[PDB]
């Protein structure tokens, strides 16, 4: 196994309620260890580990660097959110909803964006709270998601199972019905 030395720099922006709270955290990382950090809430470089202390002290002593970092939350995070509002945040892809047996009944919700979604199981009109096991939200990497929500079922005559899906792309919820065959 050959040797490798890795350095990462992440200029990270955190948004809550649109632009109500905007926070910048730039992280300097040696291998997998964050060593220095500039948190806009804090206002100055902070050493995470001993390896980053000389860097944090030096950058903090430079007035022009501190001035640029303190404006970065506006010149980067706020500035770019305007571009996201016109691009990524307009993206709406409606989910595909299917039910199939696996005793487990699987409601499959695929190829949707954004990630915000609510899925619920119903049996003969009654919402099933227990026996509902759900996979984590699966990131496909192509700006779509999928999720699988299972229901522990007992095949009993004409039990009517219904998957109910709500998503920001849908004006009305999607309801898909499955009956045992």
């Amino acid at each position: 196994s050959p040797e490798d030395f890795v350095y990462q720099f992440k200029g990270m922006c955190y948004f809550t309620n649109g632009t109500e709270r905007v926070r910048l955290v730039s992280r300097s990382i040696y291998n997998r260890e964050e060593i220095v950090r500039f948190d806009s809430d804090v206002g100055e470089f902070r050493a995470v580990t001993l390896l980053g202390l000389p860097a944090a002290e030096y950058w903090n002593s430079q007035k022009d660097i501190l001035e640029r970092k303190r404006a970065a939350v506006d010149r980067v995070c706020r500035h770019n959110y305007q571009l996201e509002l016109r691009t990524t945040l307009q993206r709406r892809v409606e989910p595909t909803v299917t039910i199939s047996p696996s005793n487990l009944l699987v409601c499959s919700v695929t190829d949707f964006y954004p990630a915000q979604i609510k899925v619920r199981w119903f049996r003969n009109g009654q919402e099933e709270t227990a026996g509902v096991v759900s996979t984590p939200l699966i990131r496909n990497g192509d700006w779509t998601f999928q999720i699988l929500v299972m229901l522990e079922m007992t095949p009993q005559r004409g039990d009517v199972y219904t998957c109910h899906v709500e998503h920001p792309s849908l004006q009305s919820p999607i309801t898909v019905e499955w009956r045992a065959q």
Partner: T-cell receptor
Amino acid sequence: RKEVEQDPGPFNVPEGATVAFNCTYSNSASQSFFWYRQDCRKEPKLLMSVYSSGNEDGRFTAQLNRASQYISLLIRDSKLSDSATYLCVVMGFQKLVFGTGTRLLVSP
Amino acid sequence: GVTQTPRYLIKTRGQQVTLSCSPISGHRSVSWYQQTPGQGLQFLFEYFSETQRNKGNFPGRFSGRQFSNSRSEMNVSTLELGDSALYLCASSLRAESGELFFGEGSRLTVLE
């Protein structure tokens, strides 16, 4: 040992004398250092920051030595109003530790 | 200046107490400390923009919150005689500052 250690027993100093406070910290990654002053049954008040070059402000001098991990506070020409408990305060990553302090009693 | 209410309190064992702290105008970080006789300052928690930022070693019955005006409250659920202390709040302009401005404290005595 404690993370921040200060001179224990009370300092009884005659008015006009110079007094030296000492403090040591264990975490070598500690980034910032401060001295606070606290009256009996009252709240702490920020006195000064500590710098390697030696922050000087009137009768007060605060110095840092990272090689030995020592923090010092010097008060020249002490007055009766200097009588208080002096807290050594050390800032590390997501940790701000207040020492238990060194009580100073200035005598006329 | 930092305002702390109430300044003095008497409570009986098993009761609950709520203390309030208004920071300096402009300051957005509020931290709570306990000063027990013969102990030294003990960190409870710090709040910045309504969310708890860091927390000390106190049990769950010690809780806090910060409102949208930066004002902060802390609560102790089931008081014990050993909880008697001076409870201090401190504010600063930015989060995780080593330069704190303390209020005058809420002096709480828990009684039989």
